[PDB]
Design a binder for this molecule. Structure first.
Ligand code: ZN
Ligand code: ZN
Ligand code: ZN
Ligand code: ZN
Lengths: 367, 367
């Protein structure tokens, strides 16, 4: 990836050098990768930290066996071995640190412990979550991050067509889900899935929180797939709904409703118009046709390094949509004991307009 | 059967004692799953934090939204709902009884964001981590927990054969990593993978931390593969090394050095001996052959609900090994620019002796 980081850091530094904070501690994860491009794979019990100061060159703490995949670094570097004790490697640092009793930011994501076990020696400051600050620089993507997103939407587009060519009758929701994960990953530059694929078939479609089960796919089933890829660590997220064998008129009716709702809501995305009104566009269409009480979630959510992040396209939200924002548009109708239908696309706001990054056929296909 | 007892819980109570902490606040993660038997996924909000003081009977706790099978929780379930702001809307049950008693054990795996909001807690309790106390119980597996490791060691053996019986040439590290994961998820539940598989070919093998890349496996490559499965939540972890084409005299030589060191460390495993002594067995052998510089990691780590836990088989560790402990023995040699070799088994200490759980071929195999 062509992105910088040094600027991201220095306007993160200068977003509390613009809100008054004296610290921010981060560990392997989204905020980490976003701030460095590095993602150390396989940590836990094994302390790994980057402290971010007033403003200036941050820090890097080990452990040893990671260096020969740490050929370059700025703020660097210090190494501890499978013999030395961390927490007491906050020794000087620890202090450094900063004045006893001033402000600090920590990863919400990260477990305490790697903190509790510091104690002595780390109950001498005013700590407060990191998300409210770093969030507002992640919620605006740069040109390159958009390229990561569109590229991620591309892989998943390719996955859709390859997949519906396959045979679905007789395989279980869990098989299909695993095969979809294998499809994604056997493509580049998929690093990985953005989340474990979801396959919801038959009346399991009416359950938004469905997790693939053992139920085999059979003629007459409407089957929802929901899955995603990572490209240079940026996430896609797509949902399509198919029918196995001729659909009923009620399925045909409900599908079109969800199609139009989604399409009109996509068209409505624009720099300057609130999140909730994009929810309302979608929600209003479903309602006009009677299914208002069967649309039982928000219309979409932000994508980024995580599959769920800002902006959140919800009925109670007047955040004003802005250039660089990336999110999902995904209304659905859910009919308990019958079936569900959701159609979900990834959208990025460029040059005042909402552009779809995912482009796979949004018409009801019969398999 | 069986899984549980718990009963105990009260072992953990009795242990947290009178060791001598007032009480324990358990969050989502390995400990929740250890103590109860369900595995709530996931959350970085809602506090979601289990009760259990000194003793008495259980109570379910914070969130929002859940559901079933918490219906199956012992004592009393407390859920709800939307948002009642549980930053002190966690006091009645729940504060009580720490109002305001002695010291505290917070579940390590709790996130610093849930711990920070709300923070109090601060104070007037003396905070220490849960892991020094609970690891005492988790490191001594019972008969059923050991059975679960046997099953997951078995899955990972079968994968080994189907793997090395396929075609390795012409495929990238990533592809191969994908077959492995896919296999594990169509060789039964598993359920899941205990971690993303590692395949490291030719010079990439020299780096223990390697992330599978596009590099294709070709003739003359030694290829390390390291993966694992979970059975009813418990973890296995195996590594094996194979050669495409016949092997050179140094591959043969180095492989045989690693084989002898792993074999002998395994044989050294006995109740009553320090984990470091077992590490020193492997290690001594490697030094003897001059290859000391190139063994850049501990001999092993423990297995449980997590892939890394106590006992750590490393130079630090004075910990006496005991019946019930499960862990890896995985010495390696890593030769920059050339190749690596690691051989890993899962060992359970039962009736005073170490017993291999994984049994896949340890001889040097030519594919
Ligand atoms: Zn979703
Ligand atoms: Zn989705
Ligand atoms: Zn391993
Ligand atoms: Zn290790």
């Amino acid at each position: 990836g062509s992105m910088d980081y040094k600027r991201r850091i220095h306007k993160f530094q200068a977003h509390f050098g613009k809100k008054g904070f004296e610290g921010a501690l981060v560990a392997p994860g989204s905020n980490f990768y976003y701030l460095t491009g590095f993602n150390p794979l396989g940590t836990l019990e094994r302390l790994f930290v980057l402290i971010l100061p007033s403003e200036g060159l941050l820090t890097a703490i080990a452990p040893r066996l990671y260096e020969k995949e740490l050929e370059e670094f700025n703020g660097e570097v210090v190494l501890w071995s499978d013999s030395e004790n961390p927490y007491k490697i906050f020794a000087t640092k620890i202090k450094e640190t900063f004045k006893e009793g001033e402000k600090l930011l920590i990863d919400d994501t990260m477990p305490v412990g790697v903190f509790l076990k510091a104690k002595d020696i780390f109950d001498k400051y005013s700590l407060h979550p990191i998300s409210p600050v770093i969030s507002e620089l992640r919620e605006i993507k740069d040109k390159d991050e958009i390229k990561a997103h569109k590229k991620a939407a591309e892989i998943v587009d390719k996955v859709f067509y390859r997949f519906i060519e396959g045979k679905l009758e007789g395989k279980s929701e869990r098989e299909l889900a695993n095969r979809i994960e294998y499809m994604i990953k056997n493509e580049f530059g998929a690093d990985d899935v953005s989340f474990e694929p979801i396959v919801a078939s038959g009346p399991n479609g009416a359950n938004p929180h469905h997790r693939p089960s053992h139920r085999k796919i059979r003629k007459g089933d409407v089957v929802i797939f929901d899955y995603g890829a990572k490209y240079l660590g940026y996430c896609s997220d797509v949902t399509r709904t198919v029918v196995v064998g001729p659909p009923s008129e009620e399925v045909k009716k409900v599908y079109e409703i969800v199609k139009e709702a989604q399409e009109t809501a996509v068209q409505k995305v624009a720099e300057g118009i609130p999140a909730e009104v994009v929810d309302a566009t979608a929600r209003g269409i479903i309602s006009k046709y009677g299914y208002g009480e069967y649309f039982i979630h928000r219309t979409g959510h932000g994508l980024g390094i995580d599959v769920h992040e800002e902006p959140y396209i919800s009925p109670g939200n007047k955040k004003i949509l802005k250039d660089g924002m990336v999110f999902t548009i995904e209304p659905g109708i859910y009919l308990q004991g019958k079936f569900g239908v959701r159609i979900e696309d990834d959208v990025a706001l460029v040059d005042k307009k909402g552009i779809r990054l995912t482009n796979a056929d949004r018409e009801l296909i019969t398999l």
